[PDB]
Amino acid sequence: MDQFECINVADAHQKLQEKEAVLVDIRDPQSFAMGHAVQAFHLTNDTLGAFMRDNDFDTPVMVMCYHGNSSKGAAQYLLQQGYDVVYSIDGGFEAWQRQFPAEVAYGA
Numbered sequence: 001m002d003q004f005e006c007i008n009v010a011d012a013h014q015k016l017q018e019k020e021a022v023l024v025d026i027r028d029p030q031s032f033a034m035g036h037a038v039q040a041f042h043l044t045n046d047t048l049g050a051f052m053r054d055n056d057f058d059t060p061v062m063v064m065c066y067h068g069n070s071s072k073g074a075a076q077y078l079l080q081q082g083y084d085v086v087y088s089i090d091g092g093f094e095a096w097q098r099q100f101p102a103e104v105a106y107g108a
Contacts, residue, residue, distance in 0.1 A: 004075035004086040009095045012062050012087070013103075021060035021085075024051070026074050027093065029108075031066070037096050038103045040064065043074075052081065060085035067092040 007015075015021040016039060024043035025036050032042050043051055043063075055061070061083055063071040071088040078086045089096070097104055 001084055002079065004072075004079055004088060006068075006072070006090050007062065007087045008090050009099050012064075012089050012096075013100060015060070015062065021062050021087070022055060023062050023064060025064045025093070026070060027065055031093075033107050035097065035104045035106055036093065037064065037100070038105050040105075042108065057082040057084055059083070060087070062087040062089055064089045064096065065092045067094060 012021075012023070016023055023037060023040045025032055025040040026043050027036075029042065036042070041047075041051065061078060063075045063078070063086065065071040065074070068088065068090040069092070071092065075086045075088045
């Protein structure tokens, strides 16, 4: 579709558990390594080319950032590239870690 949607972390977690959507994290690499959601792919302009080759445009994509702000612009960017089902995760990593502290991974 031609718009992206904002979702909360409980919704995102459920989609992930059901294997319905993939999760990308657009934060800087240092913050990513300090802690990220399990199964998050670190998506940057450099890793985008690989991401696109590896995830067809019909793949639902959920975008996480620091707080839920930059993920909106990144989600819109992905729609513009051809993705049809894109979400921005309200609250970002802060919300993820608060709700799901046992589902945090470290490093790359």
